[PDB]
Design an enzyme around this catalytic site. Sequence first.
Site, PDB file in Angstrom:
ATOM      1  N   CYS C  14      58.326  20.908  88.705  1.00 31.99           N
ATOM      2  CA  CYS C  14      59.245  22.033  88.837  1.00 31.99           C
ATOM      3  C   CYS C  14      58.750  23.033  89.876  1.00 31.99           C
ATOM      4  CB  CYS C  14      59.407  22.716  87.480  1.00 31.99           C
ATOM      5  SG  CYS C  14      60.067  21.640  86.193  1.00 31.99           S
ATOM      6  N   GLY C 512      25.730  18.435  74.427  1.00 30.10           N
ATOM      7  CA  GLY C 512      26.696  19.512  74.402  1.00 30.10           C
ATOM      8  C   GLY C 512      27.741  19.266  73.338  1.00 30.10           C
TER       9      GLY C 512
END
Lengths: 17, 18, 699, 698
Positions: C14, C512
């Site tokens: 868009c 992590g």
Amino acid sequence: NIGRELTDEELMEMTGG
Amino acid sequence: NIGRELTDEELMEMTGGS
Amino acid sequence: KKYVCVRQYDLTDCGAACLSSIAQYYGLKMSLAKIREMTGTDTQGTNAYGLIHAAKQLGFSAKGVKASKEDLLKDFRLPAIANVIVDNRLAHFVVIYSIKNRIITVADPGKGIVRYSMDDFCSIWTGGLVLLEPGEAFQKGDYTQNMMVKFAGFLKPLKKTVLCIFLASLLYTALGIAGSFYIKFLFDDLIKFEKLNDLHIISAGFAVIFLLQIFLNYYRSILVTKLGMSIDKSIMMEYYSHVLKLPMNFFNSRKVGEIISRFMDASKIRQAISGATLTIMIDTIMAVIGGILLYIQNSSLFFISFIIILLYGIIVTVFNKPIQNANRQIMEDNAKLTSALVESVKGIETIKSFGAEEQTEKSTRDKIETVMKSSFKEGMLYINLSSLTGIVAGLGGIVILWAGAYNVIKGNMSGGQLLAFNALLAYFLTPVKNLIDLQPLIQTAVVASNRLGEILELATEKELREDSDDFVISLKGDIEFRNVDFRYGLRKPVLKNINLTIPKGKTVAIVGESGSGKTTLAKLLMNFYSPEKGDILINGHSIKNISLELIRKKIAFVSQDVFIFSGTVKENLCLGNENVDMDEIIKAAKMANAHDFIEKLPLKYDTFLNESGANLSEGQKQRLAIARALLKKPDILILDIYGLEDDVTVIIIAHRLSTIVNCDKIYLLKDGEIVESGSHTELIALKGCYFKMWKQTEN
Amino acid sequence: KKYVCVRQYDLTDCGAACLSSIAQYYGLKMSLAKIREMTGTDTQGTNAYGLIHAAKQLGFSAKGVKASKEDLLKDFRLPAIANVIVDNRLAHFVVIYSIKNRIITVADPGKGIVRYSMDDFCSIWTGGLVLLEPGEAFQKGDYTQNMMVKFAGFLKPLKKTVLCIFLASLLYTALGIAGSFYIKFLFDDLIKFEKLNDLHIISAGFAVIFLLQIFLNYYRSILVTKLGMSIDKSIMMEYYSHVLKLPMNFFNSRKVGEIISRFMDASKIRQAISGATLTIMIDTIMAVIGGILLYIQNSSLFFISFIIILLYGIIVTVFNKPIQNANRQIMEDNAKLTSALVESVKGIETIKSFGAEEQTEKSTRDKIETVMKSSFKEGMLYINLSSLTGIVAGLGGIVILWAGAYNVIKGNMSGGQLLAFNALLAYFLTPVKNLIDLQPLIQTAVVASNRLGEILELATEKELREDSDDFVISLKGDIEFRNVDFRYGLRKPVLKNINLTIPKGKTVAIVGESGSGKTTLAKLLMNFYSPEKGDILINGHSIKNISLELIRKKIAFVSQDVFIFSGTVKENLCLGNENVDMDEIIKAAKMANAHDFIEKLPLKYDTFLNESGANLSEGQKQRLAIARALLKKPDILILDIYGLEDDVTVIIIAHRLSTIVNCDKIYLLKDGEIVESGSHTELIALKGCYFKMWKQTE
Ligand SMILES: CCCCCCCC/C=C/CCCCCCCC(=O)O[C@@H](COC(=O)CCCCCCCCCCCCCCC)COP(=O)([O-])OCC[N+](C)(C)C
Ligand SMILES: CCCCCCCCCCCCCCCC(=O)OCCCOP(=O)(O)OCC[N+](C)(C)C
Ligand SMILES: CCCCCCCCCCCCCCCC(=O)OCCCOP(=O)(O)OCC[N+](C)(C)C
Ligand SMILES: CCCCCCCCCCCCCCCC(=O)OCCCOP(=O)(O)OCC[N+](C)(C)C
Ligand SMILES: CCCCCCCCCCCCCCCC(=O)OCCCOP(=O)(O)OCC[N+](C)(C)C
Ligand SMILES: Nc1ncnc2c1ncn2[C@@H]1O[C@H](COP(=O)(O)OP(=O)(O)O)[C@@H](O)[C@H]1O
Ligand SMILES: Nc1ncnc2c1ncn2[C@@H]1O[C@H](COP(=O)(O)OP(=O)(O)O)[C@@H](O)[C@H]1O
């Protein structure tokens, strides 16, 4: 100079598509 | 009586169709 | 100036379409596939930040604001990308061109130029505006190319086939025109004078003419079918060959359906490349000859025929645009219904658990009703078009017979001439009707040609690579990250500042939480993506200057998301490598410990894996991937087994803190930066975040 | 005795189709859905064990053996089931019917009746065989129902529209037949005598007739379109409403596409429910009338036209079957090409890593070549059919004009009468051609009707329920599994004699390895599936005697595979019930700590989660599911102590033992049995397996 200039956090938040 | 009789556990290994 | 509306090619472009429309408004035309990557468009869509970044990169002065209802009435720039929400479901981008008074005219990339009342727009408008000006360094230009001219070059190796089709069509038309006079010869000559002997000879001659016509139609139909097959194969293979070479940001920013859907664009391009070309160059001559013959027969009847075909053309042209609008609405409603059906079937467990069966029935009934309403609208359009065309055709035939009888009574022509005119009409109106019916085909094919060929302009992975090195052959050494930054297409930065050195020939583990970015480092080390700022050095050499083939060959990456393609077990293991010994295969399978269940499987190393290894389990498929990676014999191995030489660098990506206690070095990645590093004991004693997450998770 | 070959409705029902073929050969005809559900057919097809199980259930005496090429010529039951490895890529089931003079005859459910040589069959044959014969407890019959009868019974409420369409069609036909004589009136009477005023009058009259004909066609088209849409919607909604009530073994055994393709089957059914009936009536009457008129005009020309239409019908009937076979082959090749393209695009990263772009390009080129080769075979069939039809039509027109001129010269006709005959040919050749063209439309509709309406004969979840006393109102109490046995379809058992007791109101957990079957206990507790042996008791009462509504309402299950529907956050959190007030949803979101991320959204509690919560990620969908379950207010909660009532039983399913230490009871699930039960300290002691997994995990 319409309204308030949006910050990068707000610019990245209004999306489309 | 043509062939060796398949066992109940080995029957499930003879599948078909997917 | 003219209001430019650039229609979308996919479901998520868009903002790219709006930016393209505004750029074209000021005189800068570019392909949509380039603006789509300038705006950072991805599967989710485009954000205003991407639009501002791309506009500033296009020379525009761009700015982003949040406005109110009263702010609209003020005076500002014309183009004005705006954010809306249609159906209160999904966000959307439009271009608000002008505001005369209380009426908002907008280019909607999904529908076209439309107009809203001020209240309606302010209801759908979210208050966000993207103000654009044509900057100071904005240069006009046209950087597109004609896709149809590009795809018409496939006809060049088929000139002989095109010429044969043209000659066969000319002979077919000549024989048909010759055979159209049989009824004239019957009524004017044979029936009137009772020539029984001649009748048989002339009838046999016309039967032979018709048989020759049938043979010519057979031959040219075979030729046309072969030509179409060839053109489809050529276009499809060119598109696929280019797509297989594009970078990973092309595949990560697009859906699988988007990429696959352009294989149906090849048929649409072929239609206008071959069928439309044949129709033009044949039916033009055929219609000219038929009109000349009809005018020779009678001027007034030819004028009546011309009026008939003019009315048919006017009606078809008028009904062209409404019909294509209704079809799109039907497709959208069908897509919504299909999505609802699939989503309700997949989530039947939740529906049954919560008792939401009546709700699902009502929702599906409503969607079916919407689809039926759209189908009835299109069917009514088709019925009206068919009724008008039938009125024109039937009344034209009746009037032609009427005027022909009038002329015969007046002595201008004869009955046989009137019937021969009625046949030559079948050899005149059909070519012009076929020429008129080319508008939807040509428009669809032009859209498809742009949609497919704008990707063929995209630079391949090898093209973007800089100069390589012919002296770096092994990737063994120290892996070092110098201030690496990375973002997934104009989004939040995954890595903020990365600085880590991996010792040569050692085993390291990056730790992590979910979404920390460890997989991003894994991808960046293999040149699947490039850092927006920083560098990656392997043994004192930049990652960019090493040959891409060597980088892909000497680095292996095994993740929990393995990919198995339909084929035998050996074929999966020998992916990309042709001449490989079977002993190496069995050794790699033994090292990966996949040598047991594979032998348990029938046919041993030939077991076809249906539907991407559906029969195999999750634990088994990982072992095949490990065996494949070991078969690659790499210098860097990134795992998410260990039987290689100590020289190879081993990297481990895991969220758990237990399996990596024995790793030589541990790197802790938090918030996109390496907060802590060292061995397990050092981090535990350092009382850092590693200690916190060890106490929280593993206690 | 005819060789019966039952064809496949889907891809995984080869063995079910083979067993149905054998049963029909032996005089027992049933629907394919019941046989498919007895054989244990699922997404991976069926195995031999399912075939012998269903055959024994169907009264047959059956066995499974592995034979060789030396045993394929002895004396044994001629109809058998054989396993093939077709294309060296797909295992499949075929039915062997006769071996003599070294020619194997097999019914393949995907192709039809085919005959292989010994070499080719032994190349595809696996060596496995299923031998069947009717037993003592064999009962013949026909338990199949005609589906066209009921799908036409949908036409009963719409009889007035059908009558209006019929009347409009007859009026249209009469007007067209009347208008076909304009050319005769022109040439025989108006042109010949040079009558000019009468020419204008008759031309205006025939123009008015044509306009009336156009209006009638407009009205009839509108009515036909509305009738077709009505029947489509009725069939689709009936199918969907029945499907939503079927048990979960119906959904585990089929894919999504299998369930969705019946929506196209509905339109296929309608095309013959509406199109074929109206076509038969209107076109039979019109063809009879047009034939009578043509015979009145001239007998010889009528016989010529009859021969024309006979030749056309013969050609079309001959060409019908190969066109269907070619279309089936083309669809198969397109499916293979699409699968290859999707696989290559999805796994593009692996291809790039291993440098297999050239190999993938070559494979896709080969599949495209195969698709093009299959498309040319059907293209040549249509070209040949069109050429033969054009020969017949054009030569028939030329011969009709020839014979009409001969008759006019001989005085049996007039030129105007010959032109009128040519005009009237459109009202005899077209109806009979349309009637002939109904062969492909009715066979396809019959197949689609069987496919769709065999599902509507399946029992729903509530129908299979037993007698439920209406005295139980709450599910609070000890949960007992007594000798529970279970297996997914006809596969290896998952639970082998589960026996356990979960106390009332205590937080217990079930631990084990991946694939042990921990989710199966949760599914059985919610009564999605029933145990083949044993029983499940809640508060003493058996689970089978408690109303399904209460079981589904007072038990909640939140797993990792959270499903979020396309809608607002409030709509998803209020799934199943709508008479809920916002403060309750707020409390549930606060309890499930999902309130914050919902608050920091564009439209709090109104944000539309497109594409099944694509905006959210794993971590927020789970919180939404937990909030929804808390809104459910369950007496039993299964997770993978928010609020509650301190007597609500909570069962945790996990494999990482760190988070289960505080649980009151821990049930270790190994080899389909609850091997060890106790507290964390008790099990971690010298007990056995639990200590081993505890020390191995961390
Ligand atoms: C009121 C009037 C209403 C009339 C409407 C009635 C219409 C309803 C009709 C319905 C037809 C139903 C036919 C189905 C059964 C066919 C069986 C079969 O095996 O066919 C096989 C052959 O077939 C043939 O060779 C010839 C078929 C004979 C049909 C006769 C003419 C058709 C209709 C005449 C109309 C006259 C009407 C006259 C009107 C005045 C097909 O085999 P294959 O594998 O596909 O390929 C064969 C290849 N091979 C040749 C090498 C072998
Ligand atoms: C008699 C003097 C005439 C002189 C005129 C000379 C011109 C010659 C041309 C004739 C017309 C022939 C062209 C038509 C070709 C054609 O139309 O060819 C038919 C195909 C037959 O082969 P086919 O039946 O399709 O094969 C098996 C298929 N099936 C049955 C298994 C389904
Ligand atoms: C007195 C002299 C007598 C001589 C008689 C000779 C007759 C020869 C006639 C051949 C002409 C054949 C050419 C046909 C060309 C044609 O038939 O071309 C189709 C047009 C389709 O394009 P179109 O509908 O016009 O597009 C609409 C665009 N727009 C209006 C929406 C903007
Ligand atoms: C002696 C010479 C012989 C020559 C023979 C050649 C035959 C000529 C036949 C061309 C037919 C082309 C007709 C095209 C007419 C046309 O193209 O005009 C349509 C009106 C525009 O309609 P449109 O803008 O497309 O949409 C709807 C907009 N609106 C009207 C509803 C407002
Ligand atoms: C596979 C491709 C094959 C295509 C072939 C299609 C051809 C269709 C034609 C059917 C055969 C037609 C031959 C019949 C010829 C015929 O039937 O010719 C009528 C006139 C004869 O005259 P007749 O009817 O006998 O009356 C005599 C009375 N009188 C005149 C003496 C007074
Ligand atoms: N293909 C992708 N496209 C866009 N964003 C992605 C993609 N893959 C990952 N991300 C984003 O990058 C971030 C890094 O996550 P990731 O590295 O996958 O976590 P982990 O290191 O635990 O594997 C995630 O927050 C995710 O949103
Ligand atoms: N929907 C299903 N259809 C067929 N088989 C299944 C289905 N769900 C599970 N199974 C099989 O039954 C077993 C049940 O294990 P599962 O309950 O998934 O273990 P866990 O609860 O530890 O994940 C699995 O090994 C799986 O192969």
